[PDB]
């Protein structure tokens, strides 16, 4: 499973890339919404997407990517109010996990969404 | 979209049934895990599942239903610690929302999972 990490915090993306690679995932990193849209293709199984970023924020990135891709999206951001969470889900995200987050919960939420994607893929191939 | 509500709190299930029917859903209620397994068939689009219940708890209900059904499951329970959340996701739930919860976030999470189910169904039919 290939994960596209989108966040301008280079300390967080380096830490998450190491954590997720140790959990068996292939991780690629984008540091803004424009770079995310450049790297998004059919090889991506899931996006971890921040909101506040320079060049193109995560809400605009989510709206743009949903015009061409149904790729699973988890918002992962310091914008964690109940209003922010509903906004992210309604604009096309599958899940929304505020920062600070628990590493184990993030890994379990990634695994839960990819388990459902795999079930859909098995049925489609059959 | 047809929702199976599983919780022993009759005050909560009556309130949620009214809320969800006003949001356009068809809602059926089970008050324990045994009744949930009796009511679970291919017509159910999503389960809202509690943990602490008499006769059969939600963790055992989730394990049993995952042997025959890939139906989307959201755990909705007062067992809200980070450890409880990871446990629920790892045992087969798609999402996990602790009580007390925000009504709008619950509705958005239901809508997000059913939006993904609809995308899978469209592809499968094509
Ligand atoms: Mg940021
Ligand atoms: Mg209960």
Curated annotation (Swiss-Prot), chains A, B:
Residues 2-114 form the Response regulatory domain. GO terms for biological process: cell adhesion; negative regulation of DNA-templated transcription; positive regulation of DNA-templated transcription; regulation of cell-substrate adhesion; regulation of DNA-templated transcription. The keyword Oxidoreductase does not apply. It is found in: Cytoplasm. Disruption phenotype: Loss of the Cpx envelope stress response. A double cpxR-cpxA mutant decreases transcription of degP. Cells are less sensitive to killing by nalidixic acid; double cpxR-srkA disruption mutants are as sensitive to killing as single srkA mutants, suggesting the SrkA protein kinase is partially regulated by CpxR. Hypersensitive to alkaline pH (greater than pH 8.8). Decreased numbers of stationary phase cells bind to hydrophobic surfaces, cellular adhesion has altered dynamic properties; no induction of cpxR when cells bind to hydrophobic surfaces. One of its GO terms (cellular component) is protein-DNA complex. Induction: Induced about 3-fold when stationary phase cells bind to hydrophobic surfaces; requires direct contact with hydrophobic surfaces for up-regulation of Cpx activity. Its main location: cytoplasm. Keywords: Activator, Cell adhesion, Cytoplasm, DNA-binding, Phosphoprotein, Stress response, Transcription, Transcription regulation, Two-component regulatory system. Phosphorylated by CpxA. The keyword Transferase does not apply. The modification 4-aspartylphosphate is found at residue 50. The two-component system is activated by envelope stress such as overexpression of some (misfolded) periplasmic proteins. Activated by spheroplasting (which removes the periplasm) in an autoregulatory cpxA-cpxR-dependent fashion. Cpx two-component system is activated at pH 8.0; in a degP deletion mutant activation is halved. The CpxA kinase activity is inhibited by periplasmic accessory protein CpxP; proteolysis of CpxP relieves inhibition. GO terms for molecular function: DNA-binding transcription factor activity; phosphorelay response regulator activity; transcription cis-regulatory region binding. It comes from the Bacteria. Response regulator member of the two-component regulatory system CpxA/CpxR which responds to envelope stress response by activating expression of downstream genes including cpxP, degP, dsbA and ppiA. Required for efficient binding of stationary phase cells to hydrophobic surfaces, part of the process of biofilm formation. Induced upon cell surface binding, subsequently induces genes it controls (cpxP, dsbA and spy, degP is only partially induced). Binds and activates transcription from the degP promoter; binding is enhanced by phosphorylation. Interacts with cognate sensor kinase CpxA. This is Transcriptional regulatory protein CpxR.
């Amino acid at each position: 499973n290939k994960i596209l990490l989108v966040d301008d915090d280079r300390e967080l993306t380096s830490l998450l890339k190491e954590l997720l690679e140790m959990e068996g995932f292939n991780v690629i990193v984008a540091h803004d919404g424009e770079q995310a849209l450049d790297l998004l293709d059919d090889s991506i199984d899931l996006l971890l997407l921040d909101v506040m970023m320079p060049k193109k924020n995560g809400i605009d990135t989510l709206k743009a990517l949903r015009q061409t891709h149904q790729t699973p999206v988890i918002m992962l951001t310091a914008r964690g109010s109940e209003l922010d969470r509903v906004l992210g889900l309604e604009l096309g995200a599958d899940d929304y996990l505020p920062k600070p987050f628990n590493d184990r919960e993030l890994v379990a939420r990634i695994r839960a969404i990819l388990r459902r994607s795999h079930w859909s893929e098995q049925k489609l191939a059959a």
